[PDB]
Amino acid sequence: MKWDYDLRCGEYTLNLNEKTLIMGILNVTPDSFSDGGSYNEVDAAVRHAKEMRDEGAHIIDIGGEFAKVSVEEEIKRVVPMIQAVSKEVKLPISIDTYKAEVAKQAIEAGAHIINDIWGAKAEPKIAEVAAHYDVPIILMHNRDNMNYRNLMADMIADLYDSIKIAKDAGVRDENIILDPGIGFAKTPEQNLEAMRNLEQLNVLGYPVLLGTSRKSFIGHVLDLPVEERLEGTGATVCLGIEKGCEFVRVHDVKEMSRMAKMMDAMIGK
Amino acid sequence: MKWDYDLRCGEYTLNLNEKTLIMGILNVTPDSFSDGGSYNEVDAAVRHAKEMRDEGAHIIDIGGEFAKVSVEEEIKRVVPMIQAVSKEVKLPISIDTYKAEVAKQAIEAGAHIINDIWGAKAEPKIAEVAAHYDVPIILMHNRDNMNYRNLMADMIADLYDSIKIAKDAGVRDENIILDPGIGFAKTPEQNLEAMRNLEQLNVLGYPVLLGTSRKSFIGHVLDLPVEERLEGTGATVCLGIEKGCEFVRVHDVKEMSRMAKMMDAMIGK
Ligand SMILES: CN1CC=Nc2c1nc(N)[nH]c2=O
Ligand SMILES: CN1CC=Nc2c1nc(N)[nH]c2=O
């Protein structure tokens, strides 16, 4: 249908036409008296990954950045979690990092997808890591300023700069996913505007991931704290899917999997 | 903006451009040892109308049809509820009836809007009641068979037949609201198809109400019982709003008011 290839994630394969793919956000709370890999913190992560699998998640997102942490210490946290989760939960894993070295150890430890909040712009070598291991990479829209001439024209220009960095490093078109970076470098009004105009990202010819779960633009509209943002997140997931997004990144996996599934049936996905 | 008039409901006025209007469904459980108007059953209804008002409802929908009931007995139930609710809760009231005589007493007892599941086709005199009291009337799509040549072409043809009955009786264009009658005379697949194509109803030039709350097409997609249909209802409300509907008729007023509000901000309503 829309996509003439599947997303290839080593042992796992994700069909981009059958359904909206749910990326569950692993809650990753560090042990205070620990250097990483301790029992309480890895056990908590594994229990949460199993719950999210049981609730309809298709991908488990894991990041290493409570306590301030260096690149070495970021690796010592994330690597044992990736090892335990990939052994114990049979889903592809994405590593949430903008650092080449973290991306590399995370993949060597078992991660399948790179999730980069700086779209290969903070550390362009991450795209070389992606190109060598032949993994999918999510290039998120971000910048270090909010000075838009024209929000969507500018986001598309910036995403294309990320695509260029990734292609010049030898990333294959099939391993590129884009993300409008909701809640990054954008005022609450720009986030609403990006949501209203999300379908424009489809001209670039790549699958789009949307991440809106619990973000402050929803609290800004509803005047509700982070724990009362489920309905608002749901509205953003539904619009995202109606505008053609292939993945949503969410905390409330059970509720959002049911909304995604209803949306899919109505739109004929 | 889209609408150059407000919906005029006697003492209350509903702006059709500011926001999606939430019609809350009054739960109307009859007393078993009672003829209507008893304390337990009217008190339950009033408490539920106050809760729904506090939760973001803009209209309270009240119907009279547990125990089997005649036209006279339908009036004895609905009339005391309308009287108490209209005295105690300051929102417009719609009367859910396809019967001319029930519509008439309900308005005389205080109801502001007629909600007709047969679109003036079961009892065409209801449109004369509507025309005399100068109240808004919701004409829902319904039929006594599922023999569609072409679902949407046919729904639009049938709605237009309702509009004709209503205009010939002297109903003013400003007092007409349409509704695609989701869950009426339609298979679960036709309900999905009507949802996918809802924007077509906008060619008729009238405000549209959508009622999907907890309906079996959602249980059919999600394989979930009536008490576990909140997320699925939410997806239908969101798509409905994205496709231009002015009202949604819902049981879960708190959750759906928050979803409607998020949707409004994203689409620029
Ligand atoms: C890694 N994070 C953190 C917060 N939000 C996001 C994220 N990654 C992606 N791809 N999209 C997001 O919205
Ligand atoms: C009165 N009822 C009962 C069940 N569903 C509906 C209804 N009225 C309208 N307008 N729309 C509905 O979907």
CSV table of all heavy atoms in Angstrom, one decimal, chain B residues 12-53:
chain,number,residue,atom,x,y,z
B,12,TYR,N,-30.9,30.2,26.5
B,12,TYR,CA,-29.5,29.9,26.2
B,12,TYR,C,-29.2,30.1,24.8
B,12,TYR,O,-30.0,29.9,23.9
B,12,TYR,CB,-29.1,28.5,26.7
B,12,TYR,CG,-29.6,28.2,28.1
B,12,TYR,CD1,-30.8,27.4,28.3
B,12,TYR,CD2,-28.9,28.6,29.2
B,12,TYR,CE1,-31.3,27.1,29.6
B,12,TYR,CE2,-29.4,28.2,30.5
B,12,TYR,CZ,-30.6,27.5,30.7
B,12,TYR,OH,-31.0,27.2,32.0
B,13,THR,N,-27.9,30.4,24.5
B,13,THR,CA,-27.4,30.5,23.1
B,13,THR,C,-26.1,29.7,23.0
B,13,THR,O,-25.2,29.8,23.9
B,13,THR,CB,-27.1,31.9,22.8
B,13,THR,OG1,-28.3,32.7,22.9
B,13,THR,CG2,-26.5,32.0,21.4
B,14,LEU,N,-26.0,28.9,21.9
B,14,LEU,CA,-24.8,28.1,21.7
B,14,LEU,C,-24.1,28.6,20.5
B,14,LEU,O,-24.6,28.7,19.4
B,14,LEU,CB,-25.3,26.6,21.5
B,14,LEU,CG,-26.1,26.0,22.6
B,14,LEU,CD1,-26.7,24.6,22.2
B,14,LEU,CD2,-25.3,25.8,23.8
B,15,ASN,N,-22.8,29.1,20.7
B,15,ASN,CA,-21.9,29.5,19.6
B,15,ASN,C,-21.3,28.3,18.9
B,15,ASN,O,-20.7,27.3,19.5
B,15,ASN,CB,-20.9,30.4,20.2
B,15,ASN,CG,-20.0,31.1,19.2
B,15,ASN,OD1,-19.5,30.5,18.3
B,15,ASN,ND2,-19.8,32.4,19.4
B,16,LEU,N,-21.5,28.2,17.6
B,16,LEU,CA,-21.1,27.1,16.8
B,16,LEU,C,-19.7,27.1,16.3
B,16,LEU,O,-19.2,26.2,15.7
B,16,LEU,CB,-22.1,26.9,15.6
B,16,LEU,CG,-23.5,26.7,16.0
B,16,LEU,CD1,-24.4,27.1,14.8
B,16,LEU,CD2,-23.8,25.2,16.5
B,17,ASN,N,-19.0,28.2,16.5
B,17,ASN,CA,-17.6,28.5,16.1
B,17,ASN,C,-16.5,28.4,17.2
B,17,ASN,O,-15.4,28.1,17.0
B,17,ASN,CB,-17.5,29.8,15.4
B,17,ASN,CG,-18.5,30.0,14.2
B,17,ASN,OD1,-18.5,29.1,13.3
B,17,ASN,ND2,-19.3,31.0,14.2
B,18,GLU,N,-16.9,28.8,18.4
B,18,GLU,CA,-15.9,28.8,19.5
B,18,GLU,C,-15.4,27.4,19.8
B,18,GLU,O,-14.2,27.3,20.1
B,18,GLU,CB,-16.5,29.6,20.7
B,18,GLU,CG,-17.5,28.7,21.5
B,18,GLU,CD,-18.1,29.2,22.8
B,18,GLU,OE1,-17.7,30.3,23.3
B,18,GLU,OE2,-19.1,28.5,23.2
B,19,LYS,N,-16.2,26.4,19.9
B,19,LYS,CA,-15.7,25.1,20.4
B,19,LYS,C,-16.7,24.0,20.0
B,19,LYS,O,-17.8,24.3,19.7
B,19,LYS,CB,-15.6,25.1,22.0
B,19,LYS,CG,-16.9,25.3,22.7
B,19,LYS,CD,-16.7,25.6,24.2
B,19,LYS,CE,-18.0,25.9,24.9
B,19,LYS,NZ,-17.8,26.8,26.0
B,20,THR,N,-16.3,22.7,20.1
B,20,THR,CA,-17.1,21.6,20.0
B,20,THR,C,-18.0,21.5,21.2
B,20,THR,O,-17.6,21.6,22.3
B,20,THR,CB,-16.3,20.3,19.9
B,20,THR,OG1,-15.4,20.4,18.7
B,20,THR,CG2,-17.3,19.1,19.6
B,21,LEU,N,-19.3,21.4,20.9
B,21,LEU,CA,-20.3,21.4,22.0
B,21,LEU,C,-20.6,19.9,22.5
B,21,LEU,O,-20.7,19.0,21.7
B,21,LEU,CB,-21.6,21.9,21.4
B,21,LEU,CG,-21.5,23.4,21.1
B,21,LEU,CD1,-22.7,23.9,20.4
B,21,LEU,CD2,-21.2,24.2,22.4
B,22,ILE,N,-20.6,19.8,23.8
B,22,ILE,CA,-20.7,18.4,24.4
B,22,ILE,C,-22.1,18.2,24.8
B,22,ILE,O,-22.6,18.9,25.7
B,22,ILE,CB,-19.7,18.3,25.6
B,22,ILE,CG1,-18.3,18.7,25.3
B,22,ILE,CG2,-19.9,16.9,26.3
B,22,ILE,CD1,-17.6,18.0,24.1
B,23,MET,N,-22.8,17.2,24.2
B,23,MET,CA,-24.1,16.8,24.7
B,23,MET,C,-24.0,15.6,25.6
B,23,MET,O,-23.6,14.5,25.2
B,23,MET,CB,-25.1,16.5,23.5
B,23,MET,CG,-26.5,16.0,23.9
B,23,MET,SD,-27.3,15.3,22.5
B,23,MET,CE,-28.1,16.9,21.9
B,24,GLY,N,-24.3,15.8,26.9
B,24,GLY,CA,-24.2,14.8,27.9
B,24,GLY,C,-25.5,14.0,27.9
B,24,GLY,O,-26.5,14.5,27.9
B,25,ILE,N,-25.3,12.6,28.0
B,25,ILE,CA,-26.5,11.7,28.0
B,25,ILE,C,-26.9,11.4,29.4
B,25,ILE,O,-26.2,10.8,30.2
B,25,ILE,CB,-26.1,10.3,27.3
B,25,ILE,CG1,-25.7,10.6,25.9
B,25,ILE,CG2,-27.3,9.3,27.3
B,25,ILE,CD1,-25.0,9.4,25.2
B,26,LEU,N,-28.1,11.8,29.8
B,26,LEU,CA,-28.6,11.8,31.1
B,26,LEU,C,-29.0,10.3,31.4
B,26,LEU,O,-29.7,9.7,30.6
B,26,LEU,CB,-29.8,12.7,31.4
B,26,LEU,CG,-30.1,12.8,32.9
B,26,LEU,CD1,-28.9,13.5,33.6
B,26,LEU,CD2,-31.3,13.6,33.2
B,27,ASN,N,-28.5,9.8,32.5
B,27,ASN,CA,-28.9,8.4,32.7
B,27,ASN,C,-30.2,8.5,33.5
B,27,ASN,O,-30.4,9.3,34.4
B,27,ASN,CB,-27.9,7.4,33.0
B,27,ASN,CG,-27.1,7.7,34.2
B,27,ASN,OD1,-27.7,8.3,35.1
B,27,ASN,ND2,-25.9,7.3,34.3
B,28,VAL,N,-31.2,7.7,33.0
B,28,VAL,CA,-32.6,8.0,33.3
B,28,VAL,C,-33.3,6.9,34.0
B,28,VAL,O,-34.6,6.9,34.0
B,28,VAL,CB,-33.2,8.5,31.9
B,28,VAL,CG1,-34.4,7.7,31.3
B,28,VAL,CG2,-33.4,10.1,31.9
B,29,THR,N,-32.6,5.9,34.5
B,29,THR,CA,-33.1,4.7,35.2
B,29,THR,C,-34.4,4.8,36.0
B,29,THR,O,-34.5,5.5,37.0
B,29,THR,CB,-32.1,4.2,36.2
B,29,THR,OG1,-30.8,4.1,35.5
B,29,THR,CG2,-32.4,2.8,36.7
B,30,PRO,N,-35.5,4.2,35.5
B,30,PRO,CA,-36.9,4.3,36.1
B,30,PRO,C,-37.0,3.5,37.4
B,30,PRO,O,-36.4,2.5,37.6
B,30,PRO,CB,-37.8,3.7,35.1
B,30,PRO,CG,-37.0,3.6,33.8
B,30,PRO,CD,-35.6,3.4,34.2
B,31,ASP,N,-37.8,4.1,38.3
B,31,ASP,CA,-38.2,3.4,39.5
B,31,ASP,C,-39.2,2.3,39.2
B,31,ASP,O,-40.2,2.5,38.5
B,31,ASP,CB,-38.9,4.4,40.5
B,31,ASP,CG,-37.8,5.2,41.3
B,31,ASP,OD1,-36.6,5.0,41.1
B,31,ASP,OD2,-38.3,6.0,42.2
B,32,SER,N,-38.9,1.1,39.7
B,32,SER,CA,-39.8,-0.1,39.5
B,32,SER,C,-41.2,-0.1,40.1
B,32,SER,O,-42.1,-0.8,39.6
B,32,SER,CB,-39.1,-1.4,39.9
B,32,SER,OG,-38.4,-2.1,38.8
B,33,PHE,N,-41.3,0.7,41.1
B,33,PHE,CA,-42.6,0.7,41.8
B,33,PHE,C,-43.3,2.0,41.6
B,33,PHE,O,-44.1,2.5,42.4
B,33,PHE,CB,-42.5,0.4,43.3
B,33,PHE,CG,-42.2,-1.0,43.5
B,33,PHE,CD1,-41.1,-1.4,44.3
B,33,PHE,CD2,-43.1,-2.0,43.0
B,33,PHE,CE1,-40.9,-2.8,44.6
B,33,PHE,CE2,-42.9,-3.4,43.3
B,33,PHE,CZ,-41.8,-3.7,44.1
B,34,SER,N,-43.1,2.7,40.4
B,34,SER,CA,-43.4,4.1,40.2
B,34,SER,C,-43.9,4.4,38.8
B,34,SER,O,-43.6,3.7,37.8
B,34,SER,CB,-42.2,4.9,40.6
B,34,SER,OG,-42.2,6.2,39.9
B,35,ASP,N,-44.7,5.4,38.7
B,35,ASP,CA,-45.4,5.8,37.5
B,35,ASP,C,-44.7,7.0,36.8
B,35,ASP,O,-45.0,7.4,35.7
B,35,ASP,CB,-46.9,6.1,38.1
B,35,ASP,CG,-47.7,7.1,37.3
B,35,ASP,OD1,-47.1,8.1,36.8
B,35,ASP,OD2,-48.9,6.8,37.1
B,36,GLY,N,-43.6,7.5,37.5
B,36,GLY,CA,-42.7,8.6,37.0
B,36,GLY,C,-42.7,9.7,38.1
B,36,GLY,O,-43.6,9.7,38.9
B,37,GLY,N,-41.7,10.5,38.1
B,37,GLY,CA,-41.6,11.6,39.0
B,37,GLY,C,-41.4,11.4,40.5
B,37,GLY,O,-41.4,12.3,41.3
B,38,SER,N,-41.1,10.1,40.8
B,38,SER,CA,-40.7,9.7,42.1
B,38,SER,C,-39.4,10.3,42.6
B,38,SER,O,-38.6,10.6,41.8
B,38,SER,CB,-40.8,8.2,42.3
B,38,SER,OG,-42.0,7.8,42.7
B,39,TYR,N,-39.2,10.3,43.9
B,39,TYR,CA,-38.0,11.0,44.4
B,39,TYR,C,-36.7,10.4,44.0
B,39,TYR,O,-35.8,11.1,43.6
B,39,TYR,CB,-38.1,11.3,46.0
B,39,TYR,CG,-36.8,12.0,46.6
B,39,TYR,CD1,-36.7,13.4,46.5
B,39,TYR,CD2,-35.8,11.2,47.2
B,39,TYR,CE1,-35.6,14.0,47.0
B,39,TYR,CE2,-34.7,11.8,47.7
B,39,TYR,CZ,-34.6,13.2,47.6
B,39,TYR,OH,-33.5,13.9,48.1
B,40,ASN,N,-36.6,9.1,44.2
B,40,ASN,CA,-35.3,8.4,43.9
B,40,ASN,C,-34.9,8.6,42.4
B,40,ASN,O,-33.7,8.8,42.2
B,40,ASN,CB,-35.2,6.9,44.3
B,40,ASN,CG,-35.7,6.6,45.7
B,40,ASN,OD1,-34.9,6.4,46.6
B,40,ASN,ND2,-37.0,6.6,45.9
B,41,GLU,N,-35.8,8.4,41.5
B,41,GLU,CA,-35.5,8.5,40.1
B,41,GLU,C,-35.2,9.9,39.6
B,41,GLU,O,-34.4,10.1,38.7
B,41,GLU,CB,-36.5,7.7,39.3
B,41,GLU,CG,-37.9,8.3,39.3
B,41,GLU,CD,-39.1,7.5,38.6
B,41,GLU,OE1,-38.7,6.7,37.7
B,41,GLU,OE2,-40.3,7.6,39.1
B,42,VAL,N,-36.0,10.9,40.1
B,42,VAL,CA,-35.7,12.3,39.7
B,42,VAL,C,-34.5,12.8,40.4
B,42,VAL,O,-33.7,13.5,39.8
B,42,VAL,CB,-36.9,13.2,39.9
B,42,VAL,CG1,-36.7,14.6,39.4
B,42,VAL,CG2,-38.1,12.6,39.2
B,43,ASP,N,-34.3,12.5,41.7
B,43,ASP,CA,-33.0,12.9,42.4
B,43,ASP,C,-31.8,12.3,41.7
B,43,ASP,O,-30.8,13.0,41.5
B,43,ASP,CB,-33.1,12.4,43.8
B,43,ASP,CG,-32.0,12.9,44.6
B,43,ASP,OD1,-31.9,14.2,44.8
B,43,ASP,OD2,-31.2,12.1,45.2
B,44,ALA,N,-31.8,11.0,41.3
B,44,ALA,CA,-30.7,10.4,40.5
B,44,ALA,C,-30.4,11.2,39.3
B,44,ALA,O,-29.2,11.4,39.0
B,44,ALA,CB,-30.9,8.9,40.3
B,45,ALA,N,-31.4,11.5,38.5
B,45,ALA,CA,-31.3,12.3,37.3
B,45,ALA,C,-30.7,13.7,37.5
B,45,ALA,O,-29.8,14.1,36.7
B,45,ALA,CB,-32.6,12.4,36.6
B,46,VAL,N,-31.2,14.4,38.5
B,46,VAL,CA,-30.7,15.7,38.8
B,46,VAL,C,-29.2,15.7,39.3
B,46,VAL,O,-28.4,16.6,38.8
B,46,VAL,CB,-31.6,16.4,39.9
B,46,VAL,CG1,-30.9,17.6,40.6
B,46,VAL,CG2,-32.9,16.9,39.3
B,47,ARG,N,-28.8,14.7,40.1
B,47,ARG,CA,-27.4,14.6,40.5
B,47,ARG,C,-26.6,14.3,39.3
B,47,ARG,O,-25.4,14.7,39.2
B,47,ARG,CB,-27.3,13.5,41.6
B,47,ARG,CG,-27.8,13.9,43.0
B,47,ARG,CD,-27.5,12.9,44.1
B,47,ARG,NE,-27.5,13.6,45.3
B,47,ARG,CZ,-26.5,14.2,46.0
B,47,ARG,NH1,-25.2,14.1,45.5
B,47,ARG,NH2,-26.7,14.8,47.1
B,48,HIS,N,-27.0,13.4,38.4
B,48,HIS,CA,-26.3,13.2,37.2
B,48,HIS,C,-26.2,14.4,36.3
B,48,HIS,O,-25.1,14.6,35.7
B,48,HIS,CB,-26.8,12.0,36.5
B,48,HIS,CG,-25.9,11.5,35.4
B,48,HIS,ND1,-26.3,11.0,34.2
B,48,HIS,CD2,-24.5,11.5,35.3
B,48,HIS,CE1,-25.3,10.7,33.4
B,48,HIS,NE2,-24.2,11.0,34.1
B,49,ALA,N,-27.2,15.2,36.2
B,49,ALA,CA,-27.1,16.4,35.3
B,49,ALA,C,-26.2,17.4,35.9
B,49,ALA,O,-25.4,18.0,35.2
B,49,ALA,CB,-28.5,17.0,35.1
B,50,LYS,N,-26.1,17.5,37.3
B,50,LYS,CA,-25.2,18.4,37.9
B,50,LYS,C,-23.7,18.0,37.7
B,50,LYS,O,-22.9,18.8,37.4
B,50,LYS,CB,-25.5,18.6,39.4
B,50,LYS,CG,-26.8,19.4,39.7
B,50,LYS,CD,-27.0,19.5,41.2
B,50,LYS,CE,-28.2,20.3,41.5
B,50,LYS,NZ,-28.3,20.5,43.1
B,51,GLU,N,-23.5,16.7,38.0
B,51,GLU,CA,-22.2,16.2,37.6
B,51,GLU,C,-21.8,16.4,36.2
B,51,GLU,O,-20.7,16.9,35.9
B,51,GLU,CB,-22.2,14.7,37.9
B,51,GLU,CG,-20.8,14.0,37.7
B,51,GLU,CD,-20.9,12.4,37.8
B,51,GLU,OE1,-21.2,11.9,38.9
B,51,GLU,OE2,-20.6,11.8,36.8
B,52,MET,N,-22.7,16.2,35.2
B,52,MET,CA,-22.2,16.4,33.9
B,52,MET,C,-22.0,17.9,33.5
B,52,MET,O,-21.1,18.2,32.8
B,52,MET,CB,-23.2,15.8,32.8
B,52,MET,CG,-23.2,14.2,32.7
B,52,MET,SD,-24.3,13.6,31.4
B,52,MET,CE,-25.8,14.4,32.0
B,53,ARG,N,-22.8,18.8,34.1
B,53,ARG,CA,-22.5,20.2,34.0
B,53,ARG,C,-21.2,20.6,34.6
B,53,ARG,O,-20.4,21.3,33.9
B,53,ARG,CB,-23.6,21.0,34.8
B,53,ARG,CG,-23.2,22.5,35.1
B,53,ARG,CD,-23.0,22.7,36.6
B,53,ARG,NE,-24.3,22.9,37.2
B,53,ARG,CZ,-24.6,22.7,38.5
B,53,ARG,NH1,-23.7,22.2,39.4
B,53,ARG,NH2,-25.8,23.0,38.8
